[PDB]
Design an enzyme around this catalytic site. Structure first.
Site, PDB file in Angstrom:
ATOM      1  N   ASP A 170      48.094  61.817  82.799  1.00 43.68           N
ATOM      2  CA  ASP A 170      46.974  62.448  82.104  1.00 43.68           C
ATOM      3  C   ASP A 170      45.680  61.940  82.769  1.00 43.68           C
ATOM      4  OD1 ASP A 170      45.538  63.795  79.873  1.00 43.68           O
ATOM      5  OD2 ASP A 170      45.006  61.747  79.310  1.00 43.68           O
ATOM      6  N   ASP A 180      41.766  61.631  82.587  1.00 45.63           N
ATOM      7  CA  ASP A 180      40.637  61.671  81.653  1.00 45.63           C
ATOM      8  C   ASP A 180      39.352  61.336  82.401  1.00 45.63           C
ATOM      9  OD1 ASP A 180      42.651  62.182  79.909  1.00 45.63           O
ATOM     10  OD2 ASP A 180      42.079  60.629  78.393  1.00 45.63           O
ATOM     11  N   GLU A 199      35.638  61.611  82.629  1.00 40.18           N
ATOM     12  CA  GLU A 199      34.513  61.938  81.734  1.00 40.18           C
ATOM     13  C   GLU A 199      33.235  61.673  82.506  1.00 40.18           C
ATOM     14  OE1 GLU A 199      34.978  60.237  77.627  1.00 40.18           O
ATOM     15  OE2 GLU A 199      37.103  60.372  78.024  1.00 40.18           O
ATOM     16  N   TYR A 256      35.604  66.471  69.716  1.00 34.72           N
ATOM     17  CA  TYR A 256      35.036  65.432  68.827  1.00 34.72           C
ATOM     18  C   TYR A 256      33.892  64.785  69.618  1.00 34.72           C
ATOM     19  CZ  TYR A 256      38.945  63.279  71.507  1.00 34.72           C
ATOM     20  OH  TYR A 256      39.900  62.948  72.425  1.00 34.72           O
TER      21      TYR A 256
HETATM   22  C1  LIG Z   1      33.300  56.308  75.003  1.00 37.46           C
HETATM   23  C2  LIG Z   1      32.605  57.611  74.500  1.00 37.46           C
HETATM   24  C3  LIG Z   1      31.579  57.482  73.325  1.00 37.46           C
HETATM   25  N1  LIG Z   1      30.149  57.580  73.781  1.00 37.46           N
HETATM   26  C4  LIG Z   1      29.387  56.522  74.095  1.00 37.46           C
HETATM   27  N2  LIG Z   1      28.164  56.942  74.463  1.00 37.46           N
HETATM   28  C5  LIG Z   1      28.122  58.278  74.396  1.00 37.46           C
HETATM   29  C6  LIG Z   1      29.409  58.687  73.948  1.00 37.46           C
HETATM   30  C7  LIG Z   1      29.695  60.046  73.774  1.00 37.46           C
HETATM   31  O1  LIG Z   1      30.817  60.372  73.389  1.00 37.46           O
HETATM   32  N3  LIG Z   1      28.698  61.027  74.038  1.00 37.46           N
HETATM   33  C8  LIG Z   1      29.032  62.457  73.824  1.00 37.46           C
HETATM   34  C9  LIG Z   1      29.488  63.088  75.130  1.00 37.46           C
HETATM   35  C10 LIG Z   1      29.237  64.594  75.072  1.00 37.46           C
HETATM   36  C11 LIG Z   1      30.560  65.299  74.902  1.00 37.46           C
HETATM   37  C12 LIG Z   1      30.338  66.785  74.865  1.00 37.46           C
HETATM   38  C13 LIG Z   1      30.605  67.569  73.575  1.00 37.46           C
HETATM   39  O2  LIG Z   1      30.083  67.368  75.890  1.00 37.46           O
HETATM   40  C14 LIG Z   1      27.384  60.639  74.494  1.00 37.46           C
HETATM   41  O3  LIG Z   1      26.549  61.526  74.708  1.00 37.46           O
HETATM   42  N4  LIG Z   1      27.077  59.235  74.689  1.00 37.46           N
HETATM   43  C15 LIG Z   1      25.729  58.774  75.162  1.00 37.46           C
END
Ligand SMILES: CCCn1cnc2c1c(=O)n(CCCCC(C)=O)c(=O)n2C
Ligand SMILES: CCCn1cnc2c1c(=O)n(CCCCC(C)=O)c(=O)n2C
Ligand SMILES: CCCn1cnc2c1c(=O)n(CCCCC(C)=O)c(=O)n2C
Length: 570
Positions: A290, A292, A294, A370
């Site tokens: 998988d 991932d 990001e 989410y």
């Molecule tokens: C480890 C992840 C948590 N995490 C920690 N900092 C974060 C996030 C996160 O999740 N997102 C949302 C990403 C956007 C997803 C989308 C719907 O496109 C953020 O913006 N920031 C700054």
């Protein structure tokens, strides 16, 4: 007529041998700690204290001769190699010109990483997890995290495996540029730097070998001499219990994605794909990979990285090149190997990849529906809603309109439906998409009634910062709370709200919340009702199924609602 050999159990590593050599009492580079051999090295000491020793020995496993050598005195070490994992009754015979005398049989273990030496795992699942009989062709996936064995105290035998089809093991890091890991603090970066000493950049490594294969778990029957311990030994014993369950390593995730931005160079992809192949030949209980990342194009943890022109085509090429490698493993093993990926679903993430092209190489896409809103800023919203919430402005849902400063929305809102529809519009088949459920809340402090523009909807307020709380309440990092902590400390037994919290549900969004009007704590999460709505949605569109992040945070309720919702949609 020589004396029958007596086996020296303690001097023969308690008869525990293994095709995989694993360092158990240090932490060093991955290539220093893990070495997989096609043949296990066997060394058995035996003694002939009385009478004559004879001149040769033969070793038998289950009656079949497997080795021979010289005896030259009253203590002999028999060293030989053997290729097949499992448990065998060993006998050693000493021979002279007059005859042979065989030892009594004793069980020897030859560990292999498919768990062929292990009994099915004994489970210890919370009985609030109910039994279902969901159609075996619906995906019901979850992530199990390697670090959940520590403070969270949630181990492999706690998973409700009979309610799952896929377990994604989070997370396998990649050696190389990993600044994002430094920024998270704690020991994560130091652990990775140690694992990567002596390892080429762009190869996978195990992040925490103590959790993966060193820690002794009494419930699994681990002993001092057990050659494979840890989460990985329990996952092997789990595959013996549930041979059709797919257990898949998840490479990357939000903090470990930095190296992927160098996959625009194909030599880095080639190094990575070869390392994945070696990893799946080393750890044979895994059923695929998988990815991932990001995120292609950026917008994730690495603020200085992301290439929206090139990361897309690189992601596609990586899937094609992984599917090539996986086909080689299928050819070699006669197994089926799956290729999947968890992807961002904001329009600005989806627009950077042609997923209809990528998905031809893939079994499933795990749509991360989410984290749409959360404590990284002070604007509340539903973090895992299916549809647009009441708090949204005119034109915000489809991106037609303007924000409070009059600036045009740049694209449609962050909701699960907007993401799934964008991916279908690209031509991704519905039956390859898996809809995500959150087993956690995100939340804020300071959203008090004076900040609301609509007095009955806290999503129209403004926060002062991230939710704070203790690990006792399920708060392991600021801004995030386990579902089971929301249930125990905010919802209460009746779901009517306790400890100063009230429950609400935005029926247009399909999203619950709890809100404490005095502290202004506001938490957005998934509950029984919203998860049934997601299951009805997935069934209406012919999606492949549902998955969840992350299993240790559930108390049973969310996974139960996943199965209920998939049975129940109209
Ligand atoms: C480890 C992840 C948590 N995490 C920690 N900092 C974060 C996030 C996160 O999740 N997102 C949302 C990403 C956007 C997803 C989308 C719907 O496109 C953020 O913006 N920031 C700054
Ligand atoms: C792998 C298990 C055996 N084993 C168990 N503990 C080990 C090893 C090991 O082999 N090496 C060094 C390896 C030599 C160089 C290389 C290219 O790997 C270690 O330092 N430690 C602590
Ligand atoms: C101890 C759990 C804390 N913890 C909280 N979040 C975490 C960790 C963690 O440990 N690791 C892995 C690094 C290994 C650290 C160690 C003590 O060996 C993570 O990746 N994340 C996201």
């Amino acid at each position: 007529a020589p004396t029958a050999p007596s086996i020296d159990m303690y001097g023969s590593n308690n008869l525990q041998f293994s095709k995989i050599e694993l360092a158990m009492e240090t932490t060093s580079g991955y290539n220093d700690m893990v070495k997989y051999h096609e043949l296990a090295k066997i060394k058995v000491k035996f003694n002939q204290w009385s009478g004559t020793s004879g001149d040769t020995y033969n070793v038998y496993f289950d009656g079949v001769k497997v080795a021979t050598g010289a005896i030259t005195g009253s203590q002999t070490t028999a060293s030989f190699e053997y290729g097949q994992g499992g448990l065998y009754q060993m006998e050693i015979e000493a021979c002279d010109a007059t005859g042979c005398s065989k030892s009594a049989p004793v069980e020897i273990t030859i560990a292999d990483t498919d768990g062929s030496h292990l009994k099915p795992l004994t489970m210890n699942v919370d009985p609030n997890n109910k039994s279902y009989n969901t159609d075996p062709s619906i995906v019901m996936g979850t992530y199990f995290v390697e670090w959940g064995i520590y403070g969270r105290d949630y181990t492999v035998d706690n998973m409700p495996v009979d309610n799952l089809t896929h377990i994604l093991y989070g997370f396998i890091p990649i050696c190389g540029p990993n600044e994002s890991v430094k920024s998270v603090g704690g020991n994560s970066f130091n652990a990775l730097q140690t694992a990567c000493r002596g390892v080429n950049d762009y190869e996978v490594v195990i992040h925490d070998p103590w959790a993966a294969y060193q820690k002794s778990f009494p419930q699994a029957g681990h002993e001092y001499s057990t050659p494979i311990k840890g989460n990985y030994a329990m996952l092997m014993a789990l595959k013996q219990r549930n041979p059709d369950l797919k257990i898949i390593p998840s490479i990357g995730g939000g903090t470990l994605s930095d190296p992927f931005y160098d996959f625009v160079d194909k030599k880095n992809r080639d190094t990575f794909v070869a390392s994945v192949k070696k990893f799946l030949k080393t750890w044979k209980f895994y059923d695929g990979v998988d990815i991932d990342w990001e995120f292609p194009g950026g917008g994730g943890a690495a603020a200085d990285k992301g290439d929206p022109v090139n990361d897309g085509p690189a992601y596609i090429a990586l899937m094609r090149e992984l599917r090539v490698m996986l086909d080689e493993l299928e050819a070699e093993t006669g197994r089926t190997y799956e290729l999947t990926s968890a992807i961002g679903v904001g329009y600005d993430k989806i627009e950077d990849v042609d997923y209809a092209d990528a998905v031809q190489y893939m079994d499933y896409i795990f749509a991360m529906t989410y984290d749409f809103y959360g404590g990284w800023n002070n604007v509340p919203g539903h973090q895992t809603a299916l549809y647009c919430g009441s708090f949204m402005r005119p034109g915000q849902c489809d991106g037609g309109g303007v924000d409070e400063n009059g600036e045009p929305y740049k694209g449609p809102a962050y909701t699960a439906d907007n993401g799934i529809q964008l991916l279908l519009a690209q031509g991704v088949p519905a039956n390859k998409l898996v809809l995500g459920t959150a087993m956690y809340g995100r939340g804020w402090e300071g959203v008090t009634p004076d900040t609301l523009t609509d007095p009955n909807d806290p999503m129209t307020g403004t926060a002062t910062g991230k939710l704070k709380g203790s690990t006792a309440q399920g708060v392991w990092e600021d801004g995030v709370i386990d579902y089971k902590g929301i249930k125990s400390f905010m919802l209460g037994a009746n779901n009517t709200g306790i400890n100063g919290f009230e429950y609400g549900y935005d029926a247009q969004a399909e999203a619950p919340w709890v809100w404490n009007r005095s502290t202004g704590e506001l938490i957005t999460f998934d509950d029984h009702r919203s998860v049934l709505a997601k299951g009805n949605y997935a069934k209406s569109l012919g999606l492949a199924g549902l998955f969840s992040w992350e299993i240790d945070a559930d108390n049973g309720d969310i996974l139960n609602a996943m199965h209920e919702g998939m049975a129940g949609g109209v």
